[PDB]
C-alpha cells in the first residue's frame, strides 16, 4: 500500500485533518512530517533526490515560490489549476493556492475605542504608539507585512516605518502569545492574522478583544495565501497530484477550514458567514507574486535587528 509523505508548514490540526479525509476518502496512508515552512523548504533542498517528501503544505507562498524557482515543483494537472483562479497559484502552476487570509488589528475596546485606532499600518511608527501594540517580527506573515510595505510604499519609507517599529512596539515571539496577550488586558492591541482570534474565540467561547480592518488599500490590510505542491522527486506522481487536487475539493476545503477561520482558493466557495467577507476586505493590490521569496524585506528586517 502507498504511503504518501506530507511535509506540513501549516497548523499541525489542519494537516492532520486534511490527511485524516483523504486517507478515508482513498484508502492512502498519509505519513506527516510537521515543521516551519522555512525549516521544511531548506529541508527539501538540502535532501535533493532521496527526499521522501510527496507533497508540501506550507502557511506562506515565499518558500513555494523559492521552491518552484529551483525546479524542485512538479507542474500541477490542468484539472487542479483549474479549480483556483489564477492570480492564486504559481506563475508555472507548480504551486497552488488552498486558502487566504488576512491582516487585522486586534485591539482590546475597554483599553482603547475603535475610533481611536491607528488609521494605517503605516501610523505605528509614530511615537505616540509606543507601548500600546503588539507584532511578532520573526513570523513568515509579519515578513509577507514588510514585502508589502516596500512594495507599496518603498524601501526608504518601509525603513523608516520599521525602524519606528523597532524603537516602539512590543515585540512577542508568538502570535497566539500576543493574542491572548490583547484578550488579557496586557497589550492595547497587536497586528496579527485574522484567524487568531477565531481560533481563541473558538475555545473560550467570548472575547473581549475585537477585530479592527484596515480596509482602504491600506498595506496592513494585506491578504495573503497557503499553498501546497507536489515535489518533482516524488516516487507516487498520480497519488501526489490526487492529493493536492483534493485539498481543492469541496470535502478537502471543509476539512482544512474546519481547523482554520480562512478563506477558501475553490473558486465557487464561500467562506466561514463569521468570516468578514472576502469582497469587503478592499486588500492592497499585491499578488503572491508580487510578494515574491520577501527576500528584501528580510534584509531589511535584518538590518534593523529584528
Given at each position: 500500500?502507498v504511503?504518501?509523505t506530507?511535509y506540513?508548514?501549516?497548523?499541525?490540526?489542519?494537516?492532520?485533518?486534511i490527511?485524516?479525509?483523504?486517507?478515508?476518502?482513498?484508502?492512502?496512508?498519509?505519513?506527516i512530517?510537521k515543521?516551519?515552512?522555512?525549516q521544511?523548504?531548506?529541508?527539501?533542498?538540502?535532501?535533493g533526490?532521496r527526499?521522501?517528501?510527496?507533497?508540501?503544505?506550507?502557511?506562506?507562498?515565499?518558500?513555494?515560490?523559492?521552491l518552484?524557482?529551483?525546479?524542485?515543483?512538479a507542474?500541477?494537472?490542468?484539472?487542479?489549476?483549474?479549480?483556483?483562479?489564477?492570480?492564486h497559484?504559481?506563475?508555472?502552476?507548480?504551486?497552488?493556492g488552498?486558502?487566504?487570509?488576512?491582516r487585522?488589528?486586534?485591539?482590546?475596546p475597554?483599553?482603547?475605542?475603535e475610533?481611536?485606532?491607528?488609521?494605517?499600518?503605516?501610523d505605528?511608527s509614530d511615537?505616540?504608539?509606543?507601548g500600546?501594540?503588539?507584532?511578532?517580527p520573526?513570523?513568515?506573515?509579519?515578513?509577507?507585512?514588510?514585502?508589502a510595505?516596500?512594495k507599496?510604499?518603498?524601501?526608504?519609507?518601509a525603513?523608516?516605518?520599521?525602524?519606528?517599529?523597532?524603537?516602539?512596539?512590543?515585540?512577542y515571539?508568538?502570535?497566539?502569545?500576543?493574542?491572548?496577550?490583547?484578550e488579557?488586558?496586557?497589550?492595547?492591541?497587536?497586528?496579527?492574522?485574522?484567524?487568531?482570534?477565531y481560533?481563541?474565540?473558538k475555545?473560550k467561547?467570548?472575547?473581549?478583544?475585537r477585530?479592527?480592518?484596515f480596509?482602504?488599500?491600506?498595506?496592513?490590510?494585506?491578504?495573503t495565501?497557503?499553498?501546497?505542491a507536489?515535489?518533482?522527486?516524488?516516487?507516487?506522481?498520480r497519488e501526489?497530484?490526487q492529493?493536492?487536487?483534493?485539498?481543492?475539493?469541496?470535502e478537502?476545503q471543509k476539512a482544512?477550514?474546519?481547523?482554520?477561520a480562512?478563506?477558501?482558493?475553490?473558486?465557487?466557495?464561500?467562506?466561514?458567514?463569521?468570516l468578514?467577507?472576502?469582497?469587503?476586505?478592499?486588500?492592497?493590490?499585491?499578488?503572491p507574486?508580487d510578494?515574491?521569496?520577501?527576500?528584501?524585506?528580510?534584509?531589511l528586517?535584518?538590518?534593523?535587528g529584528?
Open positions: 500500500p504511503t504518501l506530507l506540513n508548514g501549516q497548523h499541525a490540526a489542519t494537516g492532520i485533518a490527511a485524516k479525509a483523504f486517507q478515508d476518502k482513498t484508502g492512502i496512508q498519509v505519513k512530517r515543521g516551519g515552512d522555512g521544511l523548504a531548506s529541508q527539501i533542498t538540502e535532501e533526490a527526499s521522501p517528501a510527496d507533497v508540501l503544505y506550507t502557511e506562506e507562498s515565499p518558500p513555494l515560490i523559492r518552484a524557482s529551483a525546479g524542485l515543483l507542474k500541477l494537472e490542468p484539472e487542479t489549476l483549474a479549480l483556483v483562479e489564477p492570480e497559484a504559481g506563475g508555472n502552476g507548480d504551486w497552488i488552498i486558502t487566504a487570509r488576512t487585522v488589528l486586534a485591539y482590546n475597554k483599553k482603547i475605542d475610533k481611536d485606532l491607528p488609521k494605517s499600518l503605516m505605528l511615537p505616540s504608539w509606543s500600546r501594540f503588539g507584532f511578532v520573526t513570523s513568515g506573515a509579519f515578513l509577507e507585512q514588510v514585502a510595505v516596500i507599496l510604499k518603498g524601501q526608504e519609507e525603513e523608516d516605518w520599521l525602524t519606528g517599529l523597532k524603537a516602539f512596539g512590543s515585540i515571539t508568538n502570535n497566539v502569545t500576543a493574542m491572548k496577550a490583547v488579557n488586558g496586557e497589550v492595547d492591541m497587536a497586528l496579527i492574522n485574522n484567524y487568531y482570534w481560533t481563541l474565540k475555545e467561547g467570548e472575547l473581549n478583544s477585530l479592527h480592518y480596509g482602504n488599500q491600506d498595506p496592513g490590510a494585506l491578504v495565501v497557503s499553498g501546497a507536489v515535489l518533482k522527486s516524488s516516487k507516487h506522481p501526489a497530484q492529493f493536492v487536487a483534493f485539498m481543492l475539493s469541496e478537502g482544512i477550514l474546519s481547523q482554520s480562512e478563506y477558501p482558493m475553490r473558486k465557487g466557495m464561500q467562506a466561514d458567514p463569521a468578514k467577507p472576502f469582497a469587503e476586505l478592499d486588500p492592497p493590490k499585491l499578488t507574486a510578494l515574491g521569496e520577501a527576500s528584501e524585506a528580510l534584509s528586517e535584518r538590518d534593523v529584528l
